[PDB]
Amino acid sequence: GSSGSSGSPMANSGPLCCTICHERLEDTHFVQCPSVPSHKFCFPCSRESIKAQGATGEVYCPSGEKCPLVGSNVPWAFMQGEIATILSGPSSG
Ligand SMILES: [Zn+2]
Ligand SMILES: [Zn+2]
């Protein structure tokens, strides 16, 4: 299917997929809502939300629903730690 530098480096394969891309997920690594099973945002999906919402501040669900933490009555906000792990590049050169 889709093979080459231009486009997805993989073909339409896999049971689970992203919610924003709706194509495929490299691996579980993708950011999955701790409350919403359907919500499936990969690395190149959460970041955009981390900056839009608050790169240095809090970052709610990349969907814009502010889904609360499973069991807990508080929204999950990426921590400085992950914020960088997913970003993989703070500089926008
Ligand atoms: Zn995605
Ligand atoms: Zn969510």
Curated annotation (Swiss-Prot):
It is found in: Nucleus. Highly expressed in the heart, moderately in skeletal muscle and pancreas, and weakly in brain, kidney, liver, testis, thyroid gland and lymphocytes. A zinc finger (RING-type) spans 18-65. Belongs to the IRF2BP family. Interacts with CTNNB1. It is linked to Neurodevelopmental disorder with regression, abnormal movements, loss of speech, and seizures: An autosomal dominant disorder characterized by global developmental delay or neurodevelopmental regression, hypotonia, progressive ataxia, intellectual disability, seizures, and abnormal movements. Probable E3 ubiquitin protein ligase involved in the proteasome-mediated ubiquitin-dependent degradation of target proteins. Through the degradation of CTNNB1, functions downstream of FOXF2 to negatively regulate the Wnt signaling pathway. Probably plays a role in the development of the central nervous system and in neuronal maintenance. Also acts as a transcriptional regulator of genes controlling female reproductive function. May play a role in gene transcription by transactivating GNRH1 promoter and repressing PENK promoter. This is Probable E3 ubiquitin-protein ligase IRF2BPL. It comes from Homo sapiens (Human).
